[PDB]
Design an enzyme around this catalytic site. Structure first.
Site, mmCIF file in Angstrom:
data_model
loop_
_atom_site.group_PDB
_atom_site.id
_atom_site.type_symbol
_atom_site.label_atom_id
_atom_site.label_comp_id
_atom_site.label_asym_id
_atom_site.label_seq_id
_atom_site.Cartn_x
_atom_site.Cartn_y
_atom_site.Cartn_z
ATOM 1 N N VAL A 32 4.169 7.364 5.775
ATOM 2 C CA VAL A 32 3.997 6.728 7.096
ATOM 3 C C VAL A 32 5.290 6.751 7.917
ATOM 4 O O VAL A 32 6.327 6.268 7.470
ATOM 5 C CB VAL A 32 3.527 5.244 6.953
ATOM 6 C CG1 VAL A 32 3.029 4.690 8.281
ATOM 7 C CG2 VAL A 32 2.448 5.104 5.877
ATOM 8 N N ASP A 144 -13.100 -0.692 0.249
ATOM 9 C CA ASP A 144 -11.728 -0.855 -0.211
ATOM 10 C C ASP A 144 -11.022 -2.071 0.385
ATOM 11 O O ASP A 144 -9.863 -1.989 0.787
ATOM 12 C CB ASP A 144 -10.919 0.420 0.050
ATOM 13 C CG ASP A 144 -9.716 0.546 -0.873
ATOM 14 O OD1 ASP A 144 -9.627 -0.210 -1.884
ATOM 15 O OD2 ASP A 144 -8.853 1.395 -0.590
ATOM 16 N N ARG A 148 -3.718 -5.916 0.304
ATOM 17 C CA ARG A 148 -2.835 -4.785 0.577
ATOM 18 C C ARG A 148 -3.334 -3.909 1.720
ATOM 19 O O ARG A 148 -2.548 -3.183 2.327
ATOM 20 C CB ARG A 148 -2.602 -3.944 -0.683
ATOM 21 C CG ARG A 148 -3.592 -2.792 -0.893
ATOM 22 C CD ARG A 148 -3.634 -2.302 -2.360
ATOM 23 N NE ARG A 148 -4.981 -1.840 -2.715
ATOM 24 C CZ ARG A 148 -5.858 -2.523 -3.461
ATOM 25 N NH1 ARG A 148 -5.546 -3.708 -3.984
ATOM 26 N NH2 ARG A 148 -7.059 -2.012 -3.702
ATOM 27 N N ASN A 149 -4.629 -3.991 2.022
ATOM 28 C CA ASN A 149 -5.212 -3.157 3.081
ATOM 29 C C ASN A 149 -5.380 -3.853 4.433
ATOM 30 O O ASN A 149 -5.967 -3.282 5.354
ATOM 31 C CB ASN A 149 -6.526 -2.513 2.625
ATOM 32 C CG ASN A 149 -6.317 -1.498 1.509
ATOM 33 O OD1 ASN A 149 -5.365 -0.723 1.533
ATOM 34 N ND2 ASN A 149 -7.205 -1.511 0.517
HETATM 35 C C1 LIG Z 1 4.128 0.397 5.334
HETATM 36 O O1 LIG Z 1 4.076 -0.721 6.238
HETATM 37 C C2 LIG Z 1 3.457 -0.552 7.462
HETATM 38 C C3 LIG Z 1 2.266 0.168 7.601
HETATM 39 C C4 LIG Z 1 1.673 0.307 8.857
HETATM 40 C C5 LIG Z 1 0.480 1.023 9.000
HETATM 41 O O2 LIG Z 1 -0.105 1.611 7.899
HETATM 42 C C6 LIG Z 1 -1.341 2.192 7.895
HETATM 43 C C7 LIG Z 1 -2.512 1.431 7.843
HETATM 44 C C8 LIG Z 1 -3.746 2.100 7.818
HETATM 45 C C9 LIG Z 1 -3.829 3.502 7.836
HETATM 46 C C10 LIG Z 1 -5.084 4.137 7.794
HETATM 47 C C11 LIG Z 1 -6.142 3.623 8.543
HETATM 48 N N1 LIG Z 1 -7.346 4.184 8.525
HETATM 49 C C12 LIG Z 1 -7.617 5.277 7.783
HETATM 50 C C13 LIG Z 1 -9.040 5.839 7.816
HETATM 51 C C14 LIG Z 1 -9.218 7.001 8.798
HETATM 52 C C15 LIG Z 1 -9.875 8.152 8.365
HETATM 53 C C16 LIG Z 1 -10.049 9.221 9.234
HETATM 54 C C17 LIG Z 1 -9.585 9.143 10.547
HETATM 55 C C18 LIG Z 1 -8.931 7.988 10.978
HETATM 56 C C19 LIG Z 1 -8.742 6.914 10.104
HETATM 57 N N2 LIG Z 1 -6.601 5.863 6.981
HETATM 58 C C20 LIG Z 1 -6.856 7.080 6.141
HETATM 59 C C21 LIG Z 1 -5.313 5.277 6.995
HETATM 60 O O3 LIG Z 1 -4.413 5.783 6.310
HETATM 61 C C22 LIG Z 1 -2.651 4.249 7.869
HETATM 62 C C23 LIG Z 1 -1.429 3.586 7.890
HETATM 63 F F1 LIG Z 1 -0.304 4.312 7.936
HETATM 64 C C24 LIG Z 1 -0.059 1.104 10.280
HETATM 65 C C25 LIG Z 1 0.588 0.479 11.355
HETATM 66 N N3 LIG Z 1 1.711 -0.202 11.176
HETATM 67 C C26 LIG Z 1 2.267 -0.298 9.967
HETATM 68 C C27 LIG Z 1 3.450 -1.011 9.836
HETATM 69 C C28 LIG Z 1 4.038 -1.144 8.587
HETATM 70 O O4 LIG Z 1 5.203 -1.817 8.392
HETATM 71 C C29 LIG Z 1 5.796 -2.605 9.437
HETATM 72 C C30 LIG Z 1 7.243 -2.953 9.040
HETATM 73 C C31 LIG Z 1 7.341 -3.864 7.818
HETATM 74 N N4 LIG Z 1 8.768 -4.108 7.500
HETATM 75 C C32 LIG Z 1 9.028 -5.566 7.678
HETATM 76 C C33 LIG Z 1 10.184 -6.059 6.801
HETATM 77 O O5 LIG Z 1 9.788 -5.788 5.450
HETATM 78 C C34 LIG Z 1 9.914 -4.365 5.206
HETATM 79 C C35 LIG Z 1 9.061 -3.493 6.163
#
Ligand SMILES: COc1cc2c(Oc3ccc(-c4cnc(Cc5ccccc5)n(C)c4=O)cc3F)ccnc2cc1OCCCN1CCOCC1
Length: 268
Positions: A32, A144, A148-149
Site C-alpha cells: 500500500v 471477510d 483488521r478489515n
Molecule cells: C496500512 O494502513 C493503512 C491502510 C489504508 C488503506 O488500506 C486498504 C484498505 C482496503 C483496500 C481494499 C479495499 N477493497 C478491495 C476490494 C476491491 C476489489 C476490486 C476492485 C476494487 C476493490 N481490496 C482488494 C482492497 O485491497 C486496500 C487498502 F490498501 C486504505 C486507505 N487508507 C489506509 C491508511 C492506512 O494507514 C494510515 C496511517 C496509519 N499510521 C498511523 C500511526 O501508526 C502507524 C501507521
C-alpha cells in the site's frame, strides 16, 4: 482484450493514470502506497494505493473489474469508498482508496497510546453495524469481516472494507456464506473491540475450531464488555443461521446500549 461491453461497463470505475501519481517509495494489507489523485473538477486528493500483484489473466482482471463496479456503487459513511481502479499497460492493477488517517481498527485499539472507553468501543461496533446494515440491504455478503478489515479516518468514522476463527459454523462445514454468516463474524468483531484487539481463541488450533464450537464453547465475555452486549454476541453465534439477528436489529439493539453510556475519548 477484455470483452468490449464489459470494458464499457467499467469505464466509470477506471482512473486514467494521467491523473494519478503513486509514491512507490512511501509505504503504508501489505503493498500500500501514498498516492495523489486528480479528480474531474480539478480536486487533488490524497489516497492510499494498493497494487494487486496476484493478478494475471483475463478472468481475474474481469473478476476484479466487476468487483470494482459493485464496490464503486456503494455510498455509505460506514463503508470504505472505492475512488477507482487503474489498469496499467506494464504492471499489475491498482486499487485507489481515500486515505484513512488512523489506519485499521485492530491496530488502533491494540496500541497502548490510545485509550478508548467502553462507550468508544461500543461506538466503533455500532458504526460497523450500520455499514453492514447497508451492505446487507444491497444483498452483498462480506465474507471477510474482522477488526483488521475496518478502517478509521480523521473524524474517527469506522469504514468497512475487505479467517476460520471468524467464520460461522455452517461456513466451516459447507463453505456457505450469507449475510447471516456475516453476523457471526460481526459478533467476533465485537469481541475484538471489547477486548481491544485480543486474538480470538488463542489456545485452539485453526483445525480444531469446528469441534470446539460443536461442543458449545464460545468466546468468553471480554473484560470491557457489558452484560447486555455479551448477550448480543451469543445471539450472533447461534448455530442456526435464522436464529441470529439481522444487522438492522443489531444497529437498533447496540445503539440502545451505547446510549446508556457516558464518556467518549473519540467522538463522531
Ligand atoms: C496500512 O494502513 C493503512 C491502510 C489504508 C488503506 O488500506 C486498504 C484498505 C482496503 C483496500 C481494499 C479495499 N477493497 C478491495 C476490494 C476491491 C476489489 C476490486 C476492485 C476494487 C476493490 N481490496 C482488494 C482492497 O485491497 C486496500 C487498502 F490498501 C486504505 C486507505 N487508507 C489506509 C491508511 C492506512 O494507514 C494510515 C496511517 C496509519 N499510521 C498511523 C500511526 O501508526 C502507524 C501507521
Amino acid at each position: 482484450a477484455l470483452n468490449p461491453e464489459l470494458v464499457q461497463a467499467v469505464q466509470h470505475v477506471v482512473i486514467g493514470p494521467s491523473s494519478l501519481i503513486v509514491h512507490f517509495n512511501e509505504v503504508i494489507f501489505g503493498c500500500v502506497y501514498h498516492g495523489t489523485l486528480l479528480d474531474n473538477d480539478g480536486k487533488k486528493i490524497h489516497c492510499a494505493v494498493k497494487s494487486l500483484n496476484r493478478i494475471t489473466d483475463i478472468g481475474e482482471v474481469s473478476q476484479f473489474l466487476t468487483e470494482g463496479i459493485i464496490m464503486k456503487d456503494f455510498s455509505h459513511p460506514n463503508v470504505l469508498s472505492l475512488l477507482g481502479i487503474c489498469l496499467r499497460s506494464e504492471g499489475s492493477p491498482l486499487v485507489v482508496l481515500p486515505y484513512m488517517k488512523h489506519g485499521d481498527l485492530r491496530n488502533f485499539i491494540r496500541n497502548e497510546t490510545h485509550n478508548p472507553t467502553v462507550k468508544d468501543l461500543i461506538g466503533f461496533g455500532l458504526q460497523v453495524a450500520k455499514g453492514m446494515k447497508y451492505l446487507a440491504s444491497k444483498k452483498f455478503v462480506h465474507r471477510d469481516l474482522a477488526a483488521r478489515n475496518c478502517m478509521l479516518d480523521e473524524k474517527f468514522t469506522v469504514k468497512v472494507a475487505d479467517p476460520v476463527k471468524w467464520m460461522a459454523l455452517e461456513s466451516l462445514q459447507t463453505q456457505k456464506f450469507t449475510t447471516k454468516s456475516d453476523v457471526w463474524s460481526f459478533g467476533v468483531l465485537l469481541w475484538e473491540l471489547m477486548t481491544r484487539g485480543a486474538p480470538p481463541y488463542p489456545d485452539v488450533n485453526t483445525f480444531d475450531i469446528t469441534v470446539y464450537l460443536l461442543q458449545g464453547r464460545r468466546l468468553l465475555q471480554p473484560e470491557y464488555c457489558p452484560d447486555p452486549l455479551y448477550e448480543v454476541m451469543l445471539k450472533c453465534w447461534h448455530p442456526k443461521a435464522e436464529m441470529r439477528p439481522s444487522f438492522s436489529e443489531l444497529v437498533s439493539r447496540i445503539s440502545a446500549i451505547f446510549s446508556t453510556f457516558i464518556g467518549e475519548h473519540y467522538v463522531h
